Amino acid sequence: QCFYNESIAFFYNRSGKHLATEWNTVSKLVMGLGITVCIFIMLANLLVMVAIYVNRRFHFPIYYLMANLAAADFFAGLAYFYLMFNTGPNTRRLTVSTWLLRQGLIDTSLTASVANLLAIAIERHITVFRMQLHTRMSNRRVVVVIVVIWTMAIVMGAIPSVGWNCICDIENCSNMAPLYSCSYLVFWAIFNLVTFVVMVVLYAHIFGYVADLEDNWETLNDNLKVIEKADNAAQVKDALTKMRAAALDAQKGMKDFRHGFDILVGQIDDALKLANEGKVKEAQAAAEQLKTTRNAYIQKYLRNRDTMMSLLKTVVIVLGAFIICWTPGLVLLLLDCCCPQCDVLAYEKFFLLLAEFNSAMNPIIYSYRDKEMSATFRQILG
Ligand SMILES: COc1cc([C@@H](O)[C@H](COc2ccc(C3(C(=O)O)CC3)cc2)OC2Cc3ccccc3C2)cc(OC)c1C
Incomplete structure (x- = not known):
C-alpha cells in the first residue's frame, strides 16, 4: 500500500467512491460544459489583465492585485481543463x-485566489485609514507581495504531495479523495474557512468605521441647521454639545490629518462659550463660520471617498461571490471525514461547477461596476 505500483482502482475501491469504465451521458455533458466555461475563464480574465496593462489610470497597487487575482483564475482555467x-x-x-x-493544480489555484483576496482586504484596510493611494515605492512592493501570494499557493498545493497523504496510511483515506488523508482535508477546509471569517472581519471594521464617520457627519450637518433657526440660548447649547461629542469620535481611528478636524472642535468650543454668556446672535454667527470650514474639505475628502467606496463595494461583491460558492464545497470536505453515515455526498458535481463559475464571475463583476474598465474592454477587441 505504502507507495506501491497500484492503479487508481485500488484506492477508489477501498473508499466509498464510484469509478466509471464506460463513457457516461452526464460525463460527456459535464466535460462539454466544463471546457466551455474553462475557455471563457482563459478569455475574460486575460481581457481584464490586458485592460489594466494598457490603461494609465489602472497603474495603482489595488488594480495590480486585481490582475493577479485574474491570473490566479487563468491558472484555475488551466487546472480545471x-x-x-x-x-x-x-x-x-x-x-x-x-x-x-490534477488535485494539486486545483489546491494551488484556490490558495492563489484566497491569498490574493486576503492581500486586497489588507490593501483596502490601509488606504481607507490613509485616505488616498500610495507612491511608486508600493508598486515595487506589490511585485514582492505577488511573489508571496504565488509562493504560498505553490507550497499549499505541494504539502499533500510532500508526505501528507494517506498513501502509507491507507486506513485513514477519505471517501471523497481516495489518495488524500482525512487529517489534511480537515486542516485544509478549516484553514480556508478561517481565512474567509478574518476577511469578513476586515471589511466589517472598514464599513463600521465609515458608518461611524457618516453618522458623525450627519450629526454635524443636522445640528448646524438647528442653530441657523431663530431659537433660545438652551437650543443653541444642545446642538453645539452634540457636534462636539461627534467631532471627538470622528478623530478616533502614520498619516494623520487630525490637525484639520481639531480646528472645528475649537471653533465649536468658542461658539459654546458665547451661548453660556447669553449672546445667542453671536453664537449663531460663530456656528455659521463652521459651515464654510466644512465646505472647504468637502472637495478634498468627501468628493474622493465616493470613488474609493465604489471600488470598495466591487471588491466585497468579488469576495461575497467567492464565499457563497466555495463554502458549500469546503463544508462537504468536513462532512466527508467528520459525518460518516449521517448523509450521502451526492451533490459533488454541483459544488465543483459552482466554484468553477466564480473564476469567470470576477471579470463580469468589473464589467458592470467599474465605469473606466467597461470602456477599456471594447478598445482591446477593436
Ligand atoms: C482539497 O480540497 C478539494 C478537493 C476537491 C475534489 O477532490 C473533490 C472531488 O469531487 C469531484 C466532484 C466532481 C467532479 C467532476 C465529475 O463530474 O466527475 C466535475 C469533474 C470531480 C471530482 O471535490 C469536492 C467538491 C468541491 C467543490 C468545491 C470545493 C471543494 C470540493 C470538494 C476539489 C477542490 O476544489 C474544487 C478542493 C479545494
Missing part, C-alpha cells in the same frame, strides 16, 4: 503521480 479531461472513464487512466497533479 486538465481535471475535466481526466473525469469519468478517464479517471481510471490516471496514475498515482498524475492524480496528485
Whole structure:
C-alpha cells in the first residue's frame, strides 16, 4: 500500500467512491460544459489583465492585485481543463503521480485566489485609514507581495504531495479523495474557512468605521441647521454639545490629518462659550463660520471617498461571490471525514461547477461596476 505500483482502482475501491469504465451521458455533458466555461475563464480574465496593462489610470497597487487575482483564475482555467479531461472513464487512466497533479493544480489555484483576496482586504484596510493611494515605492512592493501570494499557493498545493497523504496510511483515506488523508482535508477546509471569517472581519471594521464617520457627519450637518433657526440660548447649547461629542469620535481611528478636524472642535468650543454668556446672535454667527470650514474639505475628502467606496463595494461583491460558492464545497470536505453515515455526498458535481463559475464571475463583476474598465474592454477587441 505504502507507495506501491497500484492503479487508481485500488484506492477508489477501498473508499466509498464510484469509478466509471464506460463513457457516461452526464460525463460527456459535464466535460462539454466544463471546457466551455474553462475557455471563457482563459478569455475574460486575460481581457481584464490586458485592460489594466494598457490603461494609465489602472497603474495603482489595488488594480495590480486585481490582475493577479485574474491570473490566479487563468491558472484555475488551466487546472480545471486538465481535471475535466481526466473525469469519468478517464479517471481510471490516471496514475498515482498524475492524480496528485490534477488535485494539486486545483489546491494551488484556490490558495492563489484566497491569498490574493486576503492581500486586497489588507490593501483596502490601509488606504481607507490613509485616505488616498500610495507612491511608486508600493508598486515595487506589490511585485514582492505577488511573489508571496504565488509562493504560498505553490507550497499549499505541494504539502499533500510532500508526505501528507494517506498513501502509507491507507486506513485513514477519505471517501471523497481516495489518495488524500482525512487529517489534511480537515486542516485544509478549516484553514480556508478561517481565512474567509478574518476577511469578513476586515471589511466589517472598514464599513463600521465609515458608518461611524457618516453618522458623525450627519450629526454635524443636522445640528448646524438647528442653530441657523431663530431659537433660545438652551437650543443653541444642545446642538453645539452634540457636534462636539461627534467631532471627538470622528478623530478616533502614520498619516494623520487630525490637525484639520481639531480646528472645528475649537471653533465649536468658542461658539459654546458665547451661548453660556447669553449672546445667542453671536453664537449663531460663530456656528455659521463652521459651515464654510466644512465646505472647504468637502472637495478634498468627501468628493474622493465616493470613488474609493465604489471600488470598495466591487471588491466585497468579488469576495461575497467567492464565499457563497466555495463554502458549500469546503463544508462537504468536513462532512466527508467528520459525518460518516449521517448523509450521502451526492451533490459533488454541483459544488465543483459552482466554484468553477466564480473564476469567470470576477471579470463580469468589473464589467458592470467599474465605469473606466467597461470602456477599456471594447478598445482591446477593436
Ligand atoms: C482539497 O480540497 C478539494 C478537493 C476537491 C475534489 O477532490 C473533490 C472531488 O469531487 C469531484 C466532484 C466532481 C467532479 C467532476 C465529475 O463530474 O466527475 C466535475 C469533474 C470531480 C471530482 O471535490 C469536492 C467538491 C468541491 C467543490 C468545491 C470545493 C471543494 C470540493 C470538494 C476539489 C477542490 O476544489 C474544487 C478542493 C479545494
